[PDB]
Amino acid sequence: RAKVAMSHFEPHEYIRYDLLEKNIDIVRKRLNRPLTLSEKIVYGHLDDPANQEIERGKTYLRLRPDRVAMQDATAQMAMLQFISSGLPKVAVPSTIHCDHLIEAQLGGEKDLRRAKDINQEVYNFLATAGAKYGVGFWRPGSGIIHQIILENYAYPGVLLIGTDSHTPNGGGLGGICIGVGGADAVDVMAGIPWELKCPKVIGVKLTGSLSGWTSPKDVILKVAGILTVKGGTGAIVEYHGPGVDSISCTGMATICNMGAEIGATTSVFPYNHRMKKYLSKTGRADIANLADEFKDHLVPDPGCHYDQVIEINLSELKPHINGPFTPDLAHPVAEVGSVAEKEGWPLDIRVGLIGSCTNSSYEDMGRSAAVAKQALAHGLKCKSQFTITPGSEQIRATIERDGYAQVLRDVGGIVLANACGPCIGQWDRKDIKKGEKNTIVTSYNRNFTGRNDANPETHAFVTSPEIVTALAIAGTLKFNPETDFLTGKDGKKFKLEAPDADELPRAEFDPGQDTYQHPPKDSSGQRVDVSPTSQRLQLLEPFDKWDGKDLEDLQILIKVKGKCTTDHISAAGPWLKFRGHLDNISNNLLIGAINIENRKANSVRNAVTQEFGPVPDTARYYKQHGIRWVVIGDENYGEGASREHSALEPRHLGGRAIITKSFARIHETNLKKQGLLPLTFADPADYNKIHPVDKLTIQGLKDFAPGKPLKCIIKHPNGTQETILLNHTFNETQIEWFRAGSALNRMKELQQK
Ligand code: SF4
Ligand SMILES: [O]
C-alpha cells in the first residue's frame, strides 16, 4: 500500500492500516453488527481474528500492540525484569522518557542541572540498557511522557501500551493507548501475545460548543463527578456527537487523560479535522493524508451499541474544581467558596500550580497568559505563590518565543523544568510545617492524601490552567472570576475578561534542544553495570514456585478500611529514589492505608509480640519467622497509578493473597503477574465476618479452574469456623503464572530449560 513511517526516528517501521482493515473485516463478518470506534481499533489488532471469542466484559483478547513507551520511574523495574528474561533485543518500537525524577526547588535549568548530578547512576543505567536492547531514550529535560508521545508517536488507529496510567492521553489523536505495569510491557517487548479483558463501551455524546471560561478540563471534571472513580472500570469511554468538533486536539487529550480517574481501560475521540490540523503542525502531514484515505475505520460504524450513554451539552457546562481528596468530588467554581466554608476546608490559597500531562500545552499556557496580562494591565501580581510546568522542550521554547513565559513571570510565577515535579510530590516545599492545614489549587488530575508534598493535611483541588491563574491572582477560593471584581493599582474595580488564545502557534513550533538519543543498532555490545553495593539499583532473584498445597492458617497483616490507592500502598515523592531497589522500596509497604482496628496509618499489631508498630517492619518479622500473610481490603482496591511495586513489594515481604470487595484493573493484573492471588468476596457482607485476629485457609488450589471459586475457612480464635466463597478472574494463562511463581518464571521455563 503506501510506505508511511510511524515516526521521524523509525523510518523503516510502517503504519499498517492495510492490516487493520483486513482484520476489522474478518471480524464484522463473524459478528454481523455495527462496531464502535474502539471495537474496530482493538479487534483490528487481534492475534487471531478468525478464532478469538469476543464477548464484552467476558473474554480475554490476545492482542498485538504497535509500540511500548516507559517513563523513568517505572522503566527501571520493567528493564530489570527484561534483563532477567534473557532476550537480546526488544521486538517492537520502544521508548524511555526521563520526566519523573527532576525535583522542584529553584526553578528551570538549576533543578535540571542538580537532577543530572544526583540521579546520574539511574539515567546511566537506563541510557545503557537502552543502547543495548534497542530502545530509544529521551534525556532529562525533554518533557513529560505524554506530551512527547502526542507530539511524536501517537496517530489515528495506533494500539500503544505505556507503563503509566495516564497513557489514555493518546486517545486525543484517535488511538487506543492503554496503561499497563512493567511485566505487561516485558511480554510485548519479548514478542508474546498481550491479553486484555474485552471492554464494555460507554458513549458520551457531546453537544453545543464550549463558551467563555469553560474549557476541555470541565468536561472531564463533570464526567468524573457523574460516573465516579469506580464508574468506568472495565469499559472504554468513546466520545462522539456534534460538540466534538468544537474542541482542540490537545483539549481532547486532556479529557482522555483524566478518564483514568474513573478507572476506564482508555478513552478515544474519532478522527476529525482538528487532529489532521495538529498532525500537520507537528510535521506528520503524510500520516494525516493516509488516515484520510482510511477514514471509515477511524470513525464508529453508524448505529453502534454503547452499554451506557451519557450526553453533555457543552454550551450549558460551566467551570468546575474537584476535590479535596478525591478527583470525583465535583463543585462548580461558583459555590466552591461556600462549600469549603461550611466543610472546614482552608479558604486561603498558598500555591497555584499549572502543569502536568493533563494541562501542559501551548493552548493551556496561552489561555493562562491571557488572564495574567489583564491583571498586569491594572498593576497586580499574584497574591498566591505561582509555579508553571511546560509539557516539553518544544512547548517551552515556543511559549518563550511567542511571549507567554514572560507574562507568567511578570505576574510572579516561577517556571519549572519540563518534568512531572510537584505532581508525584517531587517538590521541596517549605512554606508550611508538616501537618499544617492548607489549600493548594492545581491543574493536575489526582489529589490523594500527601501526594504532592507528603503532608496529609494539604487540601488539594484540581481545575483548569486559566482558573488556577485567576484564583492565584486573588489568593482565595471565595472568588468567582466570572462575577467578582478585583481592585487595581489605579483605584478602580475591574472584572476579568474570559481568556482567548490560539490552539497552536501561528508560526511553526520551535523545537528547542536535542533530547533524543537513538539506539546504536550496530554497537549494543555494552555491558549494563549494576553496582553490587548500590542503594538505588539491584538485580532480582526469582520468586519461589507454588508448593502444590493450600494455604492453611494465614495471618492477616492488615484489614484496610476505606479508599486504598497505590499512593497509599506504595508512596511516591521521596521513595522514587528506590524504584530500582526492591528491598529498599519495600520499606514503604502500606504505610498510608488506614487500619480498621485503631483508625490509624502505619500502626498494626504484631500477632506474636503484641506490640503495635509499622506495617513493613511487621511484615519483615512475619517473613523472618515463617508466617504467611494476607491483606483484607475494601472497594476499588489498588485505585490510581499503575506502579507494579505495589504488587512486587507484598510478594517480597512474604504476602500470599489480597482479598477485597473489588479491585482496580491494573493493580489486579499486576498482582496475578507477581505470583499473588487477588480474590474478591462472592458476597461483600463477608468483609464484616473477618476480624484482625482470625486465621484464614484458602482451599482447593489443587483443582483451581476458570469460573470455579475458592473456599475460605475463617478460623475464629474461640474455635468457631466459617466457610465463605471467593471469586477470581483467572483464565488458564494466568493459572500457569501462579503455579510457576510469577509470569516471568513461567516465561523462562518455556525457553526449553
Ligand atoms: S499524572 Fe503527574 S506524575 Fe503521573 S505522568 Fe502526569 S505529570 Fe507525571
Ligand atoms: O501519571
Swiss-Prot record:
Q: Which positions does the record annotate as the modified residue N6-succinyllysine?
A: 3, 22, 110, 116, 205, 383, 489, 495, 521, 545, 549, 563, 577, 600, 661, 695, 702
The UniProt similarity line reads: Belongs to the aconitase/IPM isomerase family.
Q: Which residues carry this modification: Phosphoserine?
A: 531, 642
Note describing how the cofactor binds: Binds 1 [4Fe-4S] cluster per subunit. Binding of a [3Fe-4S] cluster leads to an inactive enzyme.
Cofactor names from the entry are: [4Fe-4S] cluster
Broad enzyme group? lyase
The name this protein goes by in its record: Aconitate hydratase, mitochondrial
Location relative to the cell: Mitochondrion
Q: Please list the residues that carry the modification N6-acetyllysine.
A: 22, 110, 116, 205, 489, 495, 545, 577, 695, 702, 708, 711, 715
Q: What biological process terms from GO does the record include?
A: tricarboxylic acid cycle
Q: Which organism is it from?
A: Sus scrofa
Name its pathway: Carbohydrate metabolism; tricarboxylic acid cycle; isocitrate from oxaloacetate: step 2/2
Which annotated residues bind [4Fe-4S] cluster? Answer: 357, 420, 423
Offer one Pfam family short name for this entry: Aconitase_C
Alphabetized UniProt keyword annotations: 4Fe-4S, Acetylation, Iron, Iron-sulfur, Lyase, Metal-binding, Mitochondrion, Phosphoprotein, Pyrrolidone carboxylic acid, Transit peptide, Tricarboxylic acid cycle
